[PDB]
PDB file of C-alpha atoms and ligand atoms in Angstrom:
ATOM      1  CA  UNK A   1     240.100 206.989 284.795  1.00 19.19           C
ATOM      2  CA  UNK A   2     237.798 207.221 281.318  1.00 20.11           C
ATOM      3  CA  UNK A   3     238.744 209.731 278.514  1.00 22.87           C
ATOM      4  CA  UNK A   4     236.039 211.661 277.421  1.00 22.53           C
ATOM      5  CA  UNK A   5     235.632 213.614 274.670  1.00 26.62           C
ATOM      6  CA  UNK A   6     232.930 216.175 274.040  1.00 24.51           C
ATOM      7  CA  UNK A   7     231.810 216.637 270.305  1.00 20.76           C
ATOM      8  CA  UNK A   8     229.737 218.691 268.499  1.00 18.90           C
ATOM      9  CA  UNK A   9     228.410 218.616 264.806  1.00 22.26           C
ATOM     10  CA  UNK A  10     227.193 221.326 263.307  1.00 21.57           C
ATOM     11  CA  UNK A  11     226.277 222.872 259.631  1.00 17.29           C
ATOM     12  CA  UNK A  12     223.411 223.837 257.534  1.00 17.78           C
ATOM     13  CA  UNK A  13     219.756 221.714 257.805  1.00 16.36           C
ATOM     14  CA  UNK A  14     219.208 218.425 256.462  1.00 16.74           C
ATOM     15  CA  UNK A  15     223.329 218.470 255.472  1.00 17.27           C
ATOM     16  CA  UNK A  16     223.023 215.059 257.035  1.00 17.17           C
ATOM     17  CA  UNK A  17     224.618 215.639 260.383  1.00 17.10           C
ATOM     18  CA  UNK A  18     222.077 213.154 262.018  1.00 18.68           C
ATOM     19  CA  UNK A  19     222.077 210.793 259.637  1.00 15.82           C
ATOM     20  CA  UNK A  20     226.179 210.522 260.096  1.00 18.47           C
ATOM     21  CA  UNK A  21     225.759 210.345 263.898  1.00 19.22           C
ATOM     22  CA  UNK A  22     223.498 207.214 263.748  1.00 17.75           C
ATOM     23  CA  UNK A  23     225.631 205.250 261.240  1.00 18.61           C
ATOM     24  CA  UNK A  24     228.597 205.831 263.830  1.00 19.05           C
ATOM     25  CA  UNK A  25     226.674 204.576 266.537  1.00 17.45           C
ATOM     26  CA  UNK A  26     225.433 202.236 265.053  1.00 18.30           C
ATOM     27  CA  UNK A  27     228.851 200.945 264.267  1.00 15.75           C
ATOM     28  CA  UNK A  28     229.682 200.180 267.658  1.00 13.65           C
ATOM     29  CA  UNK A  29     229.934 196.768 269.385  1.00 12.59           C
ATOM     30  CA  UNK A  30     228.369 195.101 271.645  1.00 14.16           C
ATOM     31  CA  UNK A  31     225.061 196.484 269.299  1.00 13.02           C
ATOM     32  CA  UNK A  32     223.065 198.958 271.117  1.00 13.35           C
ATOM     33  CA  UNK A  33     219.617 200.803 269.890  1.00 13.93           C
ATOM     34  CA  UNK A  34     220.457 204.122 268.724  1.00 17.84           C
ATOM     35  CA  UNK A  35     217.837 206.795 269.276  1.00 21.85           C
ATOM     36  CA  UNK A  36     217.294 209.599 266.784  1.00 21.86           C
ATOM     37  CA  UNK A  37     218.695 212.419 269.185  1.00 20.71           C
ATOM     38  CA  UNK A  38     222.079 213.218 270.331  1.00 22.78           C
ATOM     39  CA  UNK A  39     222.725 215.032 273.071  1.00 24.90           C
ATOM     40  CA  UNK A  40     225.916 214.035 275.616  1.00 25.29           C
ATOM     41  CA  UNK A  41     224.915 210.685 274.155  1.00 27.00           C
ATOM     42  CA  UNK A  42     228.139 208.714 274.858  1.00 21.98           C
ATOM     43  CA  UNK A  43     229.683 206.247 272.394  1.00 21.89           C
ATOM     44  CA  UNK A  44     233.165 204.156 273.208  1.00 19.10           C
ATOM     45  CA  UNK A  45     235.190 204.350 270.646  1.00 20.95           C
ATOM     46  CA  UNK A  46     238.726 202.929 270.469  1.00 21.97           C
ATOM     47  CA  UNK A  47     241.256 204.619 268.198  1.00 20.71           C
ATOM     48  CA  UNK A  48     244.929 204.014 268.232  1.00 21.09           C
ATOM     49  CA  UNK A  49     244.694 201.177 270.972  1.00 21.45           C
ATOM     50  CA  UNK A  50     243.217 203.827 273.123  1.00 24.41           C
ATOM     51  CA  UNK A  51     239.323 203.714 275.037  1.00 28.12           C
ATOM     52  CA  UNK A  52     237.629 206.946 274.560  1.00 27.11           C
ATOM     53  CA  UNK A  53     234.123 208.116 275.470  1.00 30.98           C
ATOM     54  CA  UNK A  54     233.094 210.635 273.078  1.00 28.90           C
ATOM     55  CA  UNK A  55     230.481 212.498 273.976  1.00 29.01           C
ATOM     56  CA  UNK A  56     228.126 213.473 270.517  1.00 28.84           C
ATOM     57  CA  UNK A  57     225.911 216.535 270.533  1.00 27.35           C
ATOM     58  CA  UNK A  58     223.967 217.378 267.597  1.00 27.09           C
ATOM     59  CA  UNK A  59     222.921 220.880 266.859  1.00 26.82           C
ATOM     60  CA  UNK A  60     219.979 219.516 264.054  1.00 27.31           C
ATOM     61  CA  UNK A  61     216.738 221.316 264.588  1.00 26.97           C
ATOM     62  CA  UNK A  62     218.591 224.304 266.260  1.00 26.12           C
ATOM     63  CA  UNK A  63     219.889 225.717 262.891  1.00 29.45           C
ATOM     64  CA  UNK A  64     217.859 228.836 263.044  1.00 25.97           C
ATOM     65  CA  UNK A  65     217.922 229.365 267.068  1.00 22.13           C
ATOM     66  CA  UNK A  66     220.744 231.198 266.918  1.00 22.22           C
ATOM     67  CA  UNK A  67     220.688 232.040 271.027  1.00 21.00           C
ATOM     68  CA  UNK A  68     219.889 228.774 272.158  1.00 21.42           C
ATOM     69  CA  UNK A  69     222.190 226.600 269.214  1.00 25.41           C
ATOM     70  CA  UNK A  70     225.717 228.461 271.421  1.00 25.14           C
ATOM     71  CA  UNK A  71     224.186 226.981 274.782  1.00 27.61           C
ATOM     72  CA  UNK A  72     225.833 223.612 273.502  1.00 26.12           C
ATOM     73  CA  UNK A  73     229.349 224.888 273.360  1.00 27.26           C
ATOM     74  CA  UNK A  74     230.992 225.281 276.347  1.00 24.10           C
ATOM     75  CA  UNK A  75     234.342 222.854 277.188  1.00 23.58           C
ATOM     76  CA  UNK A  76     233.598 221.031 273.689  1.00 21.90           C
ATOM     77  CA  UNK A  77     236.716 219.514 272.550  1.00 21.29           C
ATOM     78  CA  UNK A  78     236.021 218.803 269.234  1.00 23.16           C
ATOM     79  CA  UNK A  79     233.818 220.539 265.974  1.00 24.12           C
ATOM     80  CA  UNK A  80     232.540 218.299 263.082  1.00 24.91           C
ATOM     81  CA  UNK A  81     231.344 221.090 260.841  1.00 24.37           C
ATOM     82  CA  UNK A  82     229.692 220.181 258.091  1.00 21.75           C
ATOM     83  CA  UNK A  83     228.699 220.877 254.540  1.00 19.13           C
ATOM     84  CA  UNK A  84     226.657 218.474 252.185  1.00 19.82           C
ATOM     85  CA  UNK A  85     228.625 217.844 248.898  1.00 19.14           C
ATOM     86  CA  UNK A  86     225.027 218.170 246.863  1.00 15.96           C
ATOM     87  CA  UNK A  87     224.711 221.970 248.390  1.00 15.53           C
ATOM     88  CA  UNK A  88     227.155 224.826 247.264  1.00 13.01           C
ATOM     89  CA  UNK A  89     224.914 226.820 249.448  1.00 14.85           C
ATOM     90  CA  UNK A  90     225.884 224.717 252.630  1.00 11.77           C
ATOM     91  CA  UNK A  91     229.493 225.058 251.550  1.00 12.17           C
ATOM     92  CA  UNK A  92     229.322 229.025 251.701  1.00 12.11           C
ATOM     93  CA  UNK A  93     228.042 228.716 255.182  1.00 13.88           C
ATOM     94  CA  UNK A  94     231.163 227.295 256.182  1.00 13.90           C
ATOM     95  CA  UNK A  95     233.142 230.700 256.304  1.00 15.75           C
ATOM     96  CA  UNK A  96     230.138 233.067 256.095  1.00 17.35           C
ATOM     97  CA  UNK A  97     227.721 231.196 259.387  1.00 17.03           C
ATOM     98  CA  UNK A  98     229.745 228.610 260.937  1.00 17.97           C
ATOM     99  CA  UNK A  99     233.248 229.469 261.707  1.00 22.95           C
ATOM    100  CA  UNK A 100     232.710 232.652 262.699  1.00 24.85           C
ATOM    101  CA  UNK A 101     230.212 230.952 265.770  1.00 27.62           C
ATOM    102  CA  UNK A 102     232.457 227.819 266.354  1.00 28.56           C
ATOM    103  CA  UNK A 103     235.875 230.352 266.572  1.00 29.65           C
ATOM    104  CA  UNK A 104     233.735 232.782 268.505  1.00 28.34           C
ATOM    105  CA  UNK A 105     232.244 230.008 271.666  1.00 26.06           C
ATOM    106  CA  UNK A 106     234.948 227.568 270.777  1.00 26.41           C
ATOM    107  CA  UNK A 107     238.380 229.078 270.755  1.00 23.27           C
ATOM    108  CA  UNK A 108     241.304 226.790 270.467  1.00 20.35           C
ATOM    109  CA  UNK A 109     239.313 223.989 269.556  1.00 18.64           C
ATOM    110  CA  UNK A 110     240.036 221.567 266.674  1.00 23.48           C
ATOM    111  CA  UNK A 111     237.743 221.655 263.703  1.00 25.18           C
ATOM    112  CA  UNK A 112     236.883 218.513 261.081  1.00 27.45           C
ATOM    113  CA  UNK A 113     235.692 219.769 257.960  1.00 25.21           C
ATOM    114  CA  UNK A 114     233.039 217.174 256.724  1.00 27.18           C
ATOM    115  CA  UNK A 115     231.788 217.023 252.896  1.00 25.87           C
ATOM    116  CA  UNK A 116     228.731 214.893 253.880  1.00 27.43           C
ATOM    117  CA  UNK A 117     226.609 212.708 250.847  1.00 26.70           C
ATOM    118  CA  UNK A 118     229.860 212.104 249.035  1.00 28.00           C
ATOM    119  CA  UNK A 119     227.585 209.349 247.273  1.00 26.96           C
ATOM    120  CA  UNK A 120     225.546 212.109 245.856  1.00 25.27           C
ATOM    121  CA  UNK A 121     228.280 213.591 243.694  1.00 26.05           C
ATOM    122  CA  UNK A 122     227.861 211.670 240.291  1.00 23.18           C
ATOM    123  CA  UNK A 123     224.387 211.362 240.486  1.00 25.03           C
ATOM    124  CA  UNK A 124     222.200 212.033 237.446  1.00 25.72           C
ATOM    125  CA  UNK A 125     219.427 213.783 239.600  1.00 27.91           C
ATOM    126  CA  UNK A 126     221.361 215.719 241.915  1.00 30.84           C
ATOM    127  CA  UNK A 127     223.157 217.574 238.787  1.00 30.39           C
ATOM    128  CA  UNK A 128     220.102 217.982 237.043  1.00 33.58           C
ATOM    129  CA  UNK A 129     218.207 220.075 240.347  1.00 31.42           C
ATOM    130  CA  UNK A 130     221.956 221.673 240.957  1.00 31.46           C
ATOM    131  CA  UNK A 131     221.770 222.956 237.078  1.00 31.68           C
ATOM    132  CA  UNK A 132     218.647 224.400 237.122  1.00 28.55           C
ATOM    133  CA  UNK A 133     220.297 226.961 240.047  1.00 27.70           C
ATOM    134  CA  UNK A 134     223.627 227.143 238.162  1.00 28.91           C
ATOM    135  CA  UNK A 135     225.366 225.108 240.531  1.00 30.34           C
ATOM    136  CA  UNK A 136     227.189 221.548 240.316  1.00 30.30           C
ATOM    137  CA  UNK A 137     228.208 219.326 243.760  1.00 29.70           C
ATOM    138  CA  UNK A 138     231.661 220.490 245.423  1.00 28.37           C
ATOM    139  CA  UNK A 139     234.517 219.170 244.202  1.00 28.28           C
ATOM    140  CA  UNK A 140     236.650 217.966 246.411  1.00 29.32           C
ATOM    141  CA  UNK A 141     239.655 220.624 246.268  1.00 28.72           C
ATOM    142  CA  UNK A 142     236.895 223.073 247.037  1.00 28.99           C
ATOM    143  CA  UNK A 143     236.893 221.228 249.682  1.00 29.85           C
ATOM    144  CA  UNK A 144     240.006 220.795 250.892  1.00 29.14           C
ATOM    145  CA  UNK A 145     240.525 224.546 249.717  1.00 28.20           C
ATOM    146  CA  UNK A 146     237.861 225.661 252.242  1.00 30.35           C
ATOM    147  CA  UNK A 147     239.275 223.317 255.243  1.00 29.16           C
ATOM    148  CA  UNK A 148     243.005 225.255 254.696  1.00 27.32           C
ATOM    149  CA  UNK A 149     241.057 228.630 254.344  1.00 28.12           C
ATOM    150  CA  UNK A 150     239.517 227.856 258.155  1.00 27.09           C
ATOM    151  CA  UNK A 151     242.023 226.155 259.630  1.00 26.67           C
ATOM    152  CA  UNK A 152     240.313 222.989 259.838  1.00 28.87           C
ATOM    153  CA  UNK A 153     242.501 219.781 261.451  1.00 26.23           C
ATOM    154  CA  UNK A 154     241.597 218.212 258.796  1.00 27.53           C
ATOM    155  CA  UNK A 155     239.084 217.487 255.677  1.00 27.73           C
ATOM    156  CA  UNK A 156     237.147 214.297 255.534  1.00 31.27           C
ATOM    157  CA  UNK A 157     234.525 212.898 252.828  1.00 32.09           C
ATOM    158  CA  UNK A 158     232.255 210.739 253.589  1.00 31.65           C
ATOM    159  CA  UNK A 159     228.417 209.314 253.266  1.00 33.40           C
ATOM    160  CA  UNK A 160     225.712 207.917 255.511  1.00 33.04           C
ATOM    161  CA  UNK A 161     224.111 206.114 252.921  1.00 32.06           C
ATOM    162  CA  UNK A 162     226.992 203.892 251.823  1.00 30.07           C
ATOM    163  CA  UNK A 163     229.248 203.881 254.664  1.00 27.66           C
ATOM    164  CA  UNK A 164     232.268 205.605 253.122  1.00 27.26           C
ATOM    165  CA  UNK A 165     234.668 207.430 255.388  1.00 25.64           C
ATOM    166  CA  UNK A 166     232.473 207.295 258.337  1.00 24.08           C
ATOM    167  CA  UNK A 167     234.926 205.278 260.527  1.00 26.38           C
ATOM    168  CA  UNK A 168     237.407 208.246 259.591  1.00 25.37           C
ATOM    169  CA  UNK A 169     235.955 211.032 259.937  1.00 28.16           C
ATOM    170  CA  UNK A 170     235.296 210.027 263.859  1.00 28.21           C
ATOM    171  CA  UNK A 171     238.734 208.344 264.364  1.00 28.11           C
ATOM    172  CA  UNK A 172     240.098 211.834 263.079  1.00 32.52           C
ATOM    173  CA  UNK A 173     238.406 214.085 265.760  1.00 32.03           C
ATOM    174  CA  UNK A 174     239.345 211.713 268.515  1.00 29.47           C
ATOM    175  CA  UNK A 175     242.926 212.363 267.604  1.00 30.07           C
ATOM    176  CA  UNK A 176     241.675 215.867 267.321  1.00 26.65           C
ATOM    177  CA  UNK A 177     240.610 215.957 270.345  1.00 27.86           C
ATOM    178  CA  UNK A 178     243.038 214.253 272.098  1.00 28.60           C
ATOM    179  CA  UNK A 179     245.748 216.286 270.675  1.00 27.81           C
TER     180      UNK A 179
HETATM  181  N1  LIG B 201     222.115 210.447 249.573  1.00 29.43           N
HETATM  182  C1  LIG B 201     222.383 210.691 250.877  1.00 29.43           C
HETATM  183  N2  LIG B 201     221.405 211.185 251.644  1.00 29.43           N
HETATM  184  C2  LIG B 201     221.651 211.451 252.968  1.00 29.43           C
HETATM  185  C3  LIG B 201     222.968 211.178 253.538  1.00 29.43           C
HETATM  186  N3  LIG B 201     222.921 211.561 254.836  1.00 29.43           N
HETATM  187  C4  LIG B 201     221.670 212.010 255.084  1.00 29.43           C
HETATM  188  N4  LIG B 201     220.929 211.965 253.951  1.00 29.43           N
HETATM  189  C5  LIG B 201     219.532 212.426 253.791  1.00 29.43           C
HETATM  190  O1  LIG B 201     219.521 213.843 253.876  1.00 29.43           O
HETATM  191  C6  LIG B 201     218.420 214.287 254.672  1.00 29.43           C
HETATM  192  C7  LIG B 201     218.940 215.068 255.878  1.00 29.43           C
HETATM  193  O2  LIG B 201     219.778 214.232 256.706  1.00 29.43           O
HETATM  194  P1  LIG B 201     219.862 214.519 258.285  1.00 29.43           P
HETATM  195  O3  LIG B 201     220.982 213.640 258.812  1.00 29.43           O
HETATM  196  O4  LIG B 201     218.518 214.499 258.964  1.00 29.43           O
HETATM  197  O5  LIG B 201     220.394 216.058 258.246  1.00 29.43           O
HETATM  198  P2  LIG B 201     220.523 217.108 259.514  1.00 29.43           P
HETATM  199  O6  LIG B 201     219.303 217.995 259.392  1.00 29.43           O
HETATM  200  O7  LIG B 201     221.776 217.863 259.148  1.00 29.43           O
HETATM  201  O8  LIG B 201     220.618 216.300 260.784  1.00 29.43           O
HETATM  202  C8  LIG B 201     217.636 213.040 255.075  1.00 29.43           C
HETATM  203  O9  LIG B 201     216.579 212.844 254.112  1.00 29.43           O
HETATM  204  C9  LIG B 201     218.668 211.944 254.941  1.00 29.43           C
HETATM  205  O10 LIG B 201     218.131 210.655 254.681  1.00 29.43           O
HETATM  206  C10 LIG B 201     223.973 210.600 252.625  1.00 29.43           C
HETATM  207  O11 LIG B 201     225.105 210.298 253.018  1.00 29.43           O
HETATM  208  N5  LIG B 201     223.619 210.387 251.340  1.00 29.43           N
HETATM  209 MG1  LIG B 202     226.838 223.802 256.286  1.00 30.52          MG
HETATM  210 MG1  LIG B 203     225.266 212.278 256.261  1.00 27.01          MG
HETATM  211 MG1  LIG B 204     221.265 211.526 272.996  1.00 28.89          MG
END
């Protein structure tokens, strides 16, 4: 009958993969509380004229369990893997910590790319931290660079805190997923 669609997010701590969750769910209508965990929580979502249950599991706090974090994996049919646009650092872990996992437990499944805090890119403190390492946010052909390098579906931008390219970047994995 339903369509449902197991998804998991994953990518370096506090690279706002929770934060993006909640503004999704909190998207949907009718309204419903949404609770600060994620785990097989199910949110409809219609994309293309077509009902899907997608079914959101978030891998935040289990960043550094690296036995238990793979427990989550199984029949997923869809990665968000992300990076936050004000960490170079997060970006590297994209081919050095998470693709290696998601292609290992996750073969054959579709990955989004997500540049998370896109909002975060021009802004006057962010640089001025990011200098004092030598670094400077991603640009986004690094971006898009990266998402060719690991065979990502696709590359999406977006932030929590304004909004921007949420609605896309979850629209995109249910095609994804359903392709
Ligand atoms: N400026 C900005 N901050 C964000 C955004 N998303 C999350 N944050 C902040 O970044 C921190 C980590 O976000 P969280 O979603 O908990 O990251 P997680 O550890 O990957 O789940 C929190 O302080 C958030 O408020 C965003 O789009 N823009
Ligand atoms: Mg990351
Ligand atoms: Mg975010
Ligand atoms: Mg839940």
């Amino acid at each position: 009958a339903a369509i449902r669609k197991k998804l998991v997010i994953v990518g370096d701590g506090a690279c706002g993969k929770t934060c993006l969750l909640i503004v999704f769910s909190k998207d949907q209508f009718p309204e419903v509380y949404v609770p600060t965990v994620f785990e097989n929580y199910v949110a409809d979502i219609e994309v293309d004229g077509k009902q899907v249950e997608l079914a959101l599991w978030d891998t935040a706090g289990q960043e550094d369990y690296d036995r238990l974090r793979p427990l989550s994996y199984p029949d997923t049919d869809v990665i968000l893997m992300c990076f936050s646009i004000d960490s170079p650092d997060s970006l590297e872990n994209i081919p050095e910590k998470w693709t290696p996992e998601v292609k290992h437990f996750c073969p054959n499944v579709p990955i989004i790319l997500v540049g998370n805090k896109k909002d975060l890119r021009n802004d006057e403190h962010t640089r001025r931290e990011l200098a004092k390492m030598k670094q400077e946010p991603v640009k986004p052909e690094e971006g898009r660079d990266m998402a060719n390098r690991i065979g990502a579906f696709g590359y999406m931008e977006c932030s929590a805190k304004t909004k921007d390219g949420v609605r896309e970047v979850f629209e995109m994995a249910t095609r994804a997923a359903l392709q």
